[PDB]
Symmetry: C3
Subunit: 182 residues, 3 copies
């Protein structure tokens, strides 16, 4: 297996890999163009996002936006994200329809072994993140690697999501807990 | 009743109202000027803040700063904010005298219904935020919509404030709780 | 004691002090140059950090990076920090070998008295931060003033650290608590 295939599949990979280095530069180029583009530039922004992401249809994303690869982000219909959102997509980040991200939401997929020896060994690895339909994620929340958020979930601002979230609940806190059922 | 008066009053409003859209454009223009202002350009900075806010006297605000409208921000005397502070002022954000915001403090006022049908309906709404005199808000705190913070309050770094905070306490945590009486 | 000596030693100091002011200005110049440097400007980035920090050997720091003075930052071998990290170094921030900071980690040393009269009095003070060897700090964590983090610690994303952390543990939450032993 290619290092890219290993990375996407959530296995140990090498980021210094040639293809991956090139992929990150391509994404950086597109991100940079996205972020310095004007808001009146709809065709350009839409064109850049179609190029960047694995899947996208309607998407309103305020700069500044950031991702690592782009092709690991899969966004359902009518996606909305306020400024300073970060989607670090070492592994697939799959988001359903009608998602709303408030400002400064961070979604991570990269991780490291907790054991220091292993960590300092160059080991690189990620875990996918999946988010359902009609999910609202409040300002400055953090969604950790390997998390699955169900449909119709409201994530309060500043929440740090470390475990799966079932359908139809409001979560909040660090660590995030169920606040109430919808 | 114009959409603007509805917005400010904390009622359902339509952001696409032409007057509100002109208003956000003006704010972005002013914010952009502020953020790219060289350092010794203190006059320019002061004049921009006088033009942007609903009320301001002495105010030291390190770029980058961000707000939505500007005119819903009312700042008391001797206001101070470190870099990357954000005041999303769909509704009034009233802050008393001698306020100190550390870096990356976010104050929000916009909200959404928790019900997904209602949320996906295009319903736009906010709640005011009021902060007292002599309040010190630590790095990366989040102040949520509808919250009132009393006088002489210390908000610990990273705190996420979801409810009123009475006078003379230190609060911290997410959710933020009383840590000690002053 | 020059105000500088007081600042560094964690005593009440006056920031408006000319050398300090010059020192902060110098730091801003270097940071600015670092932050706008293109990637392949290896030589330059490394040269700038050598000039900025009190101690550094191998350090990979993704822009944007930010500090107050630079000379209060002491970094051990093989230092790594992702983008948006902030080290506000009014007092010494001493970090061991093989440290890894995920994006948007904030380390603070400045503080203010909790008493309002004393706070509004112009009182300026800091507390040193010390971090051990082989520490991995997750995305958007906050390390507060006066904290000491032992060796082989993993600080979970979004954790807010307010008290010392002993060797060989994973901490997480706000406030951060021991999640498990390593
Ligand atoms: C089509 Pb392959 C498992 C580098
Ligand atoms: C228009 Pb909503 C990301 C507070
Ligand atoms: C210079 Pb004080 C708002 C951490
Ligand atoms: C050798 Pb002195 C405490 C400016
Ligand atoms: C691939 Pb690590 C510096 C969150």
């Amino acid at each position: 297996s290619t290092e890219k295939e290993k990375m996407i599949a959530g296995e140990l990979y090498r980021s210094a890999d040639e293809t991956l280095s090139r992929d990150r530069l391509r994404a950086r180029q597109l991100i940079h163009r996205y972020n310095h583009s004007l808001a009146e530039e709809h065709t350009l922004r839409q064109q850049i996002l179609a190029d960047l992401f694995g899947q996208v249809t309607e998407a309103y994303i305020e700069p500044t936006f950031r991702c690592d690869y782009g092709y690991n982000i899969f966004l359902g219909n009518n996606f909305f994200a306020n400024f300073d959102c970060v989607m670090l997509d070492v592994c697939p980040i799959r988001i359903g329809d009608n998602c709303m991200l408030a400002p400064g939401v961070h979604i991570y997929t990269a991780t490291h072994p907790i054991d220091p020896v292993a960590r300092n060994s160059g080991a690189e690895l990620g875990k996918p993140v999946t988010i359902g339909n009609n999910v609202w994620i409040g300002g400055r929340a953090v969604i950790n690697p390997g998390v699955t958020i169900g449909d119709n979930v409201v994530v309060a601002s500043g929440a740090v999501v470390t475990k799966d979230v079932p359908d139809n609940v409001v979560v909040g806190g660090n660590p995030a807990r169920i606040i109430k059922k919808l």
